[PDB]
Design a protein around this ligand. Structure first.
Ligand SMILES: [Mg+2]
Lengths: 112, 56, 336, 37, 71, 62, 342, 219, 232
RNA sequence: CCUCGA
């Protein structure tokens, strides 16, 4: 599970969509169908667009490239909205780690 | 978005002096001064700056 | 002969059975007795099957096979081509590498029980303990500033706007005078949250469910040692820090070898964990051994653990039979 | 041995078989990276 | 005090028993492979213990002055 | 000549050693390393490697 | 666990810059996939734990195992073979621990205050055990000056000479010391016959003590001492209170006026250059001198403003790790910067 | 300066959270006592959880189910939030059959006699028209946290998906002591919050009897 | 079966007043779960008798010296706190130490009232020079742990630190030695040195009893499942 | 060799 930082910049989002590992709505519409396998968008044009999800693909360096939808059936999506998350993205933004509760102190030499 | 220094028709590694690897004043806004490899490829592999763009 | 989809595999498990025709002269005396006794009469082969490499394991999640009997583009001479995809769920472990965004890297020394971890006044144990000695020396005080803001965004805040707008909050956008717990915020580089604005938010931190302010206006808190129960005598900075999992993980890097393949020219052990290689006891390491004056350790490393093709075998032979280790022969690389 | 002095490692006088040349080269090299202009 | 494992017996008394650390290494190693040859030729000369490596038995022998060496 | 060839400038050392029909005594540490012999230092010098170890008769009694 | 018992292994970290870059250890079977490296041999390997890896070699023959146990044993290589001084001393965390343990706090809890009128002095303790019980209530601080009856620790040179024979002191003999309970517990970690050191254990003082231990005591003794010091240093460092926060990073108050003054001087030099009187290289020289001095003065005001128990000051001045120009760059001011040409 | 036998006194805050006042205690002792209780509560309170699961058209974790929105991995992460109790002390099986469209929550699970699902609103999956989910969930009793028992150790067949088990019913424990300075004394206040699997009283009772059986050693 | 094996409790006797106790093997984390608690109980919750205050006749004004006596006041108090004593009276009880002439006063030179006892009569207290006398009164009470000398009165009444605890020093550590299938268990080592009132054994036993009662206070809320062992 | 790790 990916988790965007509490403390970020405005660069996570705009880097995640350009990186291209997220799925992005080419045209505005309504979600007709949504599985873990694909997402269909009925544009107001009357046409349909469908985006098959990369499911548990092997990246060049052995990390899991697993897309996951973040829309629901019936949702109104605009052009360029993010439909589905990628490997290190959370709701369209780059999520490279987790927010961890930290104490800054020495502890019995185990953080020596 | 990388900007590599080595290659055919470029410079070779035995010719990689210390000065091609320095942050040049002209890099401002074009090649990021922070992102570069720690090891041997330092100053040889740099990445394009945010708002930068290449002309024809 | 291909492993079945969904299997759980471990070191040395067959994934694809394969046999390579060896000549008759390559049958061992035993393999030649059983073949004659039971009259196998099938052409003699060597077990050249694809196994699971040392130190890895997982679920077979995908099989992909290409045949020459089917019309399939293969390289010349290649009849059948099959890929097995193995997936492992990797829990964070001792030796895995973590870092924040400020160049503050470290590997994991110990994963303690939740009860042993220093915990806040409400029982919440901390997740990660970063040593104080590492921060100031390395000039990445950004991690401390982040920790402070990380706590502010986790707890949420409500800036006192009653009498007006305090001087520190003057330059703050209206959408930042209050924030719900676990709020999401930006610190743009060179245009981020200034020191005064940050120190203000540490005052108006919303409390937890019991009305308690766990982190004071300095960013420090009182923690209990979960081993003794006694409190730690001074307030510790606690807060929320973004910590990434870097791709330098023990599972990839642990490697060991008693005996394995050897390069054909030199007869020395191959290199690389992937090839089940041996570690390189190099020039500066021989100087070290020499400087100690460890003559026999230096000889043994350089003859029977590497290059003496007969002494190798004689040594494994000796250990298995509980005898003394024999005398070194001549390194094959000197012959070369 | 008497001319060399104590073994810096052991603190007692240097033993007979010691390879003091390699130790000396190592002792001179090891901090060389600290040498700047 | 009373050190554990490899640091026992102490290197200092074992070095009282010999001239240099190198002589001690050879002393102990030759006695150790002597012992191991015995198990398939004299010794051991002390109570060996549960399952002790012959090198450790030999080091304890050298400590207890239970054997002699030349050069 | 073996030590010189293994140090650097190997072509030159080897050429000259050939013309001079040099014979390597194989005296040094590096040379015994290359051929896989016990180096002539530490536990490899003769006064230490040639130690005779036997038990005292007082101990052999018990 | 049976076969590996007492069978040494060699550990190596590259680059092997000197022979202590390879050291033998007794292996302890461990849970996990990582090698566990004693915190005191780090110096010898130049090993930190930011991702470093290390190599393991198994000596097979009796001679190789014997060379490993005798020549290369971790605890038999405690001194730098380059300088002859010990390398396996406490480093940074241990340091802040022991420096915390043995600092004396004027006015701390349970401090001995002499008898005034009818009130007693309430600072004397019949034994360090009694002082331990006192500190188990909130009554005695570890760092408060007190008077204790010491029974099993050797007294200083002159105290022993005056209250006994010059060289005579038996382990049973008692004596009175005005020290801290911390310095008691520190000296208890040193070897027995060692004269009581009653000082704040700066790193340099620990270095002095361990250099003395190296000169006067056998190898194994110094090894056991640094192990005990390590334990105490980690415990007390955890208990020490050193932490970084934006608040602990104090700013020098006069910094504005200092910098404005040196800017006035730089303006003088610039007007001097515009007249053609000052040379360009000479202008740069004068400006660099001005700003060197401004940096120096900012650093001085920074030191003057920091309380001497601030965790940053504590960490630097204990000798644990870091220097003050790092502190000046953090809190005061960065200063002048190099050119690509230098 | 004499002794009075100490009392434990409960004060219920919510249905799954209670405070516990133990007084009087020896000075300097409250912290250690509270912590010896908490460390046991956090670690050794018995409970029940799911061990393995089986899914109809699924042979392994890393795949999808037709018409469901969540891949099997996300479904198992959601099943990690499942809080459950059992009194059988032998592997028992729950079942989950449902056809879309609609949400699949823990209330849609049919446990056997003796197993109780405690958070029925908990979201498990989302189904559409073509979505059909058919799940078996083995429940067992244990304590602590036990990583997935492998398909090799158990004689499990390829279809079975082992799952990480969180048996602890305890959610969050803290304490505070009030120290009072001739006759000084410490009053301990434990604060225990559970997962709805059991109540603070029962968790504290199991922790207390584990500690009693363990301290009866010296006596 | 949700039941742990029975750990053992073994002894190493160092001196007549000092022992190390090993509890092993304990389920992971319990070394500390009962480590600090056992120590704090051994220190604070064992009853003993000790000196509370003293009146020294012959000096009230100076409160520094005792005429004809080598040792000063503070040293006499330090020696008196070192007196191990056991009483059955729930009320304070007074003792008297009187000895004259050049000699060496010991802890046997005191007359113990009924019920109280002095377990270290050989203890040095003071040395009286020629024409030297000593008459000093010692209040003794029952108590627990360690309470300081803090406790408007009759003149000459010096209150002292009361070392009630029969145990003197306790320190514990946790190592890892475990079963072959888990290899993460806790071995607990307790170093306890006591006075001569009780052996370390009895100290540990009474501490275990007080703790069993303490946590029975908790198991009394309800009686149902929790981890047990085959043997105690 | 390339990219990376200390
Ligand atoms: Mg490093």
């Amino acid at each position: 599970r990916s988790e965007a930082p509490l403390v970020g910049t405005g660069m996570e989002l705009r880097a995640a969509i350009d990186a291209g590992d997220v799925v992005v709505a080419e045209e505005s519409g309504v979600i007709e169908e949504v599985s873990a396998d694909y997402i269909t968008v009925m544009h107001d044009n009357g046409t349909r667009r469908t985006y098959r999800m990369r499911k548990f693909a092997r990246s060049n360096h052995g990390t899991c490239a697993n897309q996951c939808p973040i829309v629901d059936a019936g949702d109104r999506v605009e052009a360029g909205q993010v439909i589905a998350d990628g490997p290190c993205t959370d709701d369209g933004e780059m999520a490279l780690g987790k927010n961890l509760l930290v104490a800054i102190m020495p502890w019995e030499g185990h953080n020596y | 978005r990388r900007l590599s220094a080595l290659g055919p028709g470029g410079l070779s590694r035995e010719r990689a002096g210390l000065e091609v690897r320095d942050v040049h004043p002209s890099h401002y806004g074009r090649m990021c001064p922070i992102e570069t490899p720690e090891g041997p490829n330092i100053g040889l592999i740099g990445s394009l700056s945010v708002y930068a763009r290449v002309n024809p | 002969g291909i492993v079945r989809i969904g299997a759980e595999v471990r070191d040395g498990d067959i994934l694809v059975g394969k046999v390579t025709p060896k000549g008759e002269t390559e049958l061992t005396p035993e393999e030649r007795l059983l073949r004659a006794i039971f009259g196998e009469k099938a052409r003699e082969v060597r077990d050249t099957s694809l196994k699971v490499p040392h130190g890895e394991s997982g679920k077979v999640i995908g099989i992909r096979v290409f045949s020459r009997e089917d019309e399939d583009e293969l390289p010349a001479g290649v009849n059948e081509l099959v890929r097995v995809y193995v997936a492992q769920k990797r829990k964070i472990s001792d030796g895995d590498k973590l870092a924040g965004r400020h160049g503050n890297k470290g590997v994991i020394g110990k994963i303690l029980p939740v009860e042993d971890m220093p915990f806040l006044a409400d029982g919440t144990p901390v997740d990660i303990i970063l040593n104080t000695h590492g921060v100031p020396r390395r000039m990445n005080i950004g991690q401390i500033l982040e920790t402070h803001l990380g706590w502010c965004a986790h707890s949420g805040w409500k800036v006192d706007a009653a009498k007006g707008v305090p001087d520190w909050a003057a330059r703050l956008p209206d959408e930042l005078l209050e924030a719900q717990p676990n709020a999401i915020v930006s610190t743009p580089v060179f245009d981020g949250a200034q020191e005064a604005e940050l120190q203000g938010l540490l005052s108006c931190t919303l409390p937890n469910r019991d009305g308690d302010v766990l982190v004071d206006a300095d960013g420090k808190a009182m923690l209990f040692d979960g081993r003794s129960g006694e409190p730690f005598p001074y307030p510790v900075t606690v807060g929320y820090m973004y910590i990434m999992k870097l791709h330098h993980l023990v599972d990839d890097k642990i490697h060991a070898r008693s005996t394995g393949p050897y390069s054909m020219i030199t007869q020395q052990p191959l290199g690389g964990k992937a090839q089940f290689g041996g570690q390189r006891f190099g020039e500066m390491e021989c100087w070290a051994m020499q400087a100690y004056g460890a003559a026999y350790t230096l000889q043994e490393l350089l003859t029977i653990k590497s290059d003496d093709t007969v002494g190798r075998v004689k040594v494994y032979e000796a250990i298995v039979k509980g005898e003394n280790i024999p005398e070194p022969g001549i390194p094959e690389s000197f012959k070369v | 041995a008497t001319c060399y002095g104590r073994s810096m490692a052991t603190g007692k006088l240097v033993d007979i078989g010691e390879a003091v040349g390699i130790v000396a080269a190592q002792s001179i090299g090891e901090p060389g990276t600290q040498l700047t202009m | 005090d009373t050190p554990l494992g490899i640091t026992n017996p102490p290197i200092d008394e074992l070095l009282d028993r010999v001239s240099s650390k190198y002589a001690l290494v050879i002393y102990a190693a030759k006695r150790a492979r002597q012992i191991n040859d015995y198990y398939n030729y004299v010794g051991p000369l002390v109570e060996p213990g549960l399952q002790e490596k012959p090198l450790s038995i030999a080091l304890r022998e050298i400590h207890a002055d239970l054997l002699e060496h030349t050069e | 000549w073996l030590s010189a060839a293994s140090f650097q400038e190997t072509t030159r050392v080897l050429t000259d050693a050939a013309i001079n029909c040099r014979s390597d005594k194989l005296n040094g540490l590096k040379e015994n390393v290359i051929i896989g012999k016990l180096i002539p230092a530490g536990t490899g010098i003769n006064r230490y490697r040639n130690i005779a170890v036997q038990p005292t008769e007082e101990a052999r009694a018990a | 666990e049976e076969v590996i018992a007492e069978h040494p292994v060699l550990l190596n970290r590259a680059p092997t810059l000197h022979r202590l870059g390879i050291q033998a250890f007794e292996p302890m079977l461990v849970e996990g996939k990582a090698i566990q490296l004693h915190p005191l041999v780090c110096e010898a390997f130049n090993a930190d734990f930011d991702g470093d890896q290390m190599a393991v070699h198994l000596p097979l023959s009796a001679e190789a195992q014997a060379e490993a146990r005798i020549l290369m044993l971790s605890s038999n290589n405690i001194l730098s073979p380059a300088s002859g001084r010990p390398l396996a001393m406490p480093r940074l965390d241990m340091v802040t621990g022991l420096y915390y343990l043995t600092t004396e706090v004027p006015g701390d809890t349970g401090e001995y205050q002499p008898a005034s009128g009818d009130h007693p002095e309430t600072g004397v303790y019949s034994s360090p055990a009694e002082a331990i019980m006192a500190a188990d209530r909130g009554v005695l601080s570890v760092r408060a000056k007190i008077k204790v009856r010491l029974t099993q620790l050797r007294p200083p040179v002159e105290i022993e000479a005056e209250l006994f024979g010059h060289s005579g002191w038996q382990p049973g003999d008692a004596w009175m010391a005005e020290t801290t309970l911390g310095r008691v517990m520190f000296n208890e970690l040193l070897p027995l016959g060692y004269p009581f050191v009653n000082k704040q254990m700066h790193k340099k003082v620990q270095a002095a003590i361990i250099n003395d231990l190296a000169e006067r005591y056998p190898m194994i003794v110094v090894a056991q001492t640094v192990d005990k010091l390590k334990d105490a240093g980690f415990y007390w460092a955890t208990r020490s209170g050193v932490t970084v926060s934006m608040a602990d990073v104090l700013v020098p108050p006069r910094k504005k006026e200092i910098l404005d003054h040196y800017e006035e001087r730089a303006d003088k030099v610039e007007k001097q250059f515009q007249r053609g009187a000052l040379n360009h290289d000479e202008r740069n020289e004068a400006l660099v001198e001005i700003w060197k001095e401004a940096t120096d003065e900012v650093g001085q005001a920074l030191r003057e403003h920091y309380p001497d128990d601030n965790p940053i000051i504590t960490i630097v001045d204990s000798g644990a790790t870091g220097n003050f120009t790092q502190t000046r760059t953090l809190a005061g001011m960065k200063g002048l910067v190099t050119n690509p040409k230098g | 300066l004499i002794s009075q036998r100490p009392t434990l006194s409960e004060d219920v805050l919510t249905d799954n959270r209670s405070q516990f006042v133990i007084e009087p205690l020896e000075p300097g002792f409250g912290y250690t006592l509270g912590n010896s209780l908490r460390r046991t509560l956090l670690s050794s309170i018995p409970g029940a959880a799911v061990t393995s699961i089986r899914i109809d058209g699924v042979l392994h974790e890393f795949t999808t189910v037709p018409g469901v929105k969540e891949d099997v991995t996300e479904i198992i992460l959601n099943l990690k939030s499942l809080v459950v109790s059992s009194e059988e002390d032998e592997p028992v099986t729950m079942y989950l059959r449902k056809q879309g469209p609609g949400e699949v929550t823990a209330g849609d699970i049919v446990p056997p006699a003796g197993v109780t699902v405690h958070n029925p609103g908990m979201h498990i999956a989302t189904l559409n028209d073509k979505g059909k989910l058919e799940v078996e969930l083995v429940v067992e009793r244990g304590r602590g946290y036990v990583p997935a028992v492998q398909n090799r150790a158990s004689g499990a067949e390829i279809g079975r998906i082992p799952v990480d088990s969180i048996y602890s019913p305890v959610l969050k424990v803290t304490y505070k002591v009030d120290a009072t300075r001739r006759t000084d004394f410490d009053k301990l206040i434990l604060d225990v919050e559970t997962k709805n699997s059991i109540s603070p009283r029962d968790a504290l009772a199991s922790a207390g009897k584990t500690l009693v059986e363990l301290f009866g050693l010296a006596r």
